[PDB]
Design brief:
The structure is a homodimer.
Chain A (H helix, E strand, L loop, with lengths): L19 E6 L12 E2 L24 H4 L1 E4 L4 H12 L6 E7 L3 E4 L2 E7 L10 H15 L3 E5 L11 E4 L3 E2 L1 H7 L3 E7 L7 H12 L6 E5 L5 H14 L5 H10 L20 H21 L8 H7 L5
Parallel strand pairs in A: 1-7, 3-11, 4-10, 4-11
Antiparallel strand pairs in A: 1-6, 2-3, 5-6, 5-9, 7-8
Helix pairs in contact in A: 6-7, 6-8
The structure holds D-MYO-inositol-1,4,5-triphosphate (I3P) (2 copies) and chloride ion (CL).
One D-MYO-inositol-1,4,5-triphosphate (I3P) binds next to helix 6 of chain A.
Chain lengths: 313, 313
């Protein structure tokens, strides 16, 4: 009777309506660091107004000093070494660049770009294998070819930018390993809740980690996907902390807020409304997964548990 | 000794530096007519101040009534039908759409676009054969594909525009024949003086026209290349008219002035300067070709004559 369960709404959208049409500039490389850079060691600041939170609530910091995670937006290669260098002061563990982007991206002549389709959905519906093969094929195709690279402006369309003939092409994995970071890819679709596949892959990965591993999450802006995986990591590693505290603290170090709040979008942005609501419900559902399955050591994965414990809108 | 004779400066430029990167919007289709629409039967207007001409000068109209030519910018299909209907009111002869554009262009869902490279030079150096081959391959490749079409804005780079999955592809040949016009293509490079190859093709074409043929020339903006062939036609068919009159009258009906004038360029447009100067010289040289070959019936092709009678800087 149910075509798309809650948590899988994006499956109803049609990928053929969002195919990539331009190399989008992911970071202009002007600053020393990527945007929205934050670490779990950072001091808590006031909530953003739009979330209508209790400014005076002080969330527990239980486990934060030990969390060892960070988040950021996309970066140039120089910016990533600066990140790696900053993080290397805080740990002697391996540092992972955890790349949460389903969209095909890489570096053309050291410039960080992505193949941008409407809503950033150019790889919508593809398996991780298919997404990455596309990415590799496209990047290789750009070498010694003329390309147009532009930032998005008015109404999410190209505005200015530049044209060049590319002399070097790199994957983010190459750039990460050049900055001394290990690399882990989770192909998560922009704007929406990560898929069961996304999270099963993340959970098995998390399970292989040495104790002193530091996880640096990033996506395009370092907001939606980055925060979702920061929050999930926090819940997994610190299961005795309350839902509310996890969400308050991940927001107040510079993340998105993943609890209820009054959503009011502009008209041309109202397609986002139900995707926000979906993420809120799924955040609660993941919390529940952790509480019920951590005891036995996660004998049953998220994808399976969720099919027998469907979320409700 | 001499690497590139006058008339062939553009041959020294390197094609690989101007390769196409975007589907440019050739006309937004808001007006009923293309821009710079004019006919050889129009009233003369005041010259443009930037050319510092004698506004009191009354050029001879000898032969203009019989000249039967027109010019305009690029157009949508509906705009072309409007052009064809207006011209049909002036003549009962065959009406020609003379397409002077070297750049690859056509129509996607009826939208006039072109494959734009910097300086509009994406087909620089190609034979007319190779250029049309590029055009056919690109137009066809766009069918059922997602494309980005954009007007150029600041600094000749894409600004805004639209994204669509293309359901229909046509050549300008198709669009012209659909509007009741005969089609003739001369692949002339934007900004520069037409090659001897271009001019030879046009002269052989001119020599096969019925007496009542009406030539509608057009290029991207209907200024540079369009005026050059309107002027050439005026000289071939009205050989007894003075260089000065021709140039004055072709400007005063709405064309470019192809005589000497104080060139005032911007900085980012100083690359233009020598190409303007080249054209003024080659215009005079063509006139000389007309005068010296009007008598033996144009036995001698422009390209061979020009090689023995090279023009000087
Ligand atoms: O790429 P990430 O790190 O997942 O972050 C998202 C990304 O920057 C999107 O482009 C953005 O959409 P908009 O440009 O439409 O804001 C979205 O904001 P929103 O969904 O909160 O608007 C972010 O959450
Ligand atoms: O396509 P056509 O009819 O040959 O007309 C030319 C075309 O519009 C060029 O883009 C334009 O250069 P700009 O974009 O630099 O103006 C040039 O003007 P200019 O060479 O007089 O500047 C025109 O002559
Ligand atoms: Cl199971």
């Amino acid at each position: 009777t149910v075509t798309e369960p809650v948590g899988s709404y994006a499956r109803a959208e049609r990928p053929q309506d969002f195919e990539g049409f331009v190399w989008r500039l992911d970071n202009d490389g002007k600053e020393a660091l990527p945007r929205n850079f934050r670490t779990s060691a950072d001091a808590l600041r006031a909530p953003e107004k739009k979330f209508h939170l209790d400014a005076a609530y002080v969330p527990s910091r239980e486990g934060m000093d030990a969390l060892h995670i960070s988040g950021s937006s996309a970066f140039t290669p120089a910016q990533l070494k600066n990140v790696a260098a900053k993080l290397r002061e805080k740990t002697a563990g391996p540092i992972y660049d955890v790349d949460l982007r389903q969209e095909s991206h890489g570096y053309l002549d050291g410039i960080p770009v992505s193949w941008y389709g409407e809503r950033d959905w150019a790889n919508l519906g593809k398996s991780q294998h298919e997404a990455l093969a596309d990415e590799r094929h496209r990047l290789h195709a750009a070498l010694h070819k003329t390309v147009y690279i532009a930032p998005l402006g008015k109404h999410k369309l190209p505005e200015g930018g530049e044209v060049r003939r590319v002399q070097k092409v790199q994957t983010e994995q190459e750039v990460a390993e050049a900055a001394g970071m290990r690399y882990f890819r989770i192909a998560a679709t922009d704007h929406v809740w990560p898929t069961p596949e996304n999270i099963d892959r993340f959970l098995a990965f998390y399970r292989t980690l040495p104790q002193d591993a530091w996880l640096h999450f990033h996506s395009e802006a370092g907001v939606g996907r980055t925060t979702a995986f920061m929050v999930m990591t926090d819940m997994l590693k610190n299961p005795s902390v309350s839902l509310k505290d996890i969400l308050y603290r991940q927001h107040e170090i510079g993340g998105f807020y993943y609890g209820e709040f009054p959503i009011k979008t502009k008209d041309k942005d109202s397609w986002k409304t139900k995707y926000y609501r979906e993420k809120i419900v799924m955040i609660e559902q993941f919390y529940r997964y952790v509480q019920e399955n951590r005891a036995d050591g996660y004998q049953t994965p998220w994808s399976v548990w969720l099919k027998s414990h469907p979320a409700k809108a």
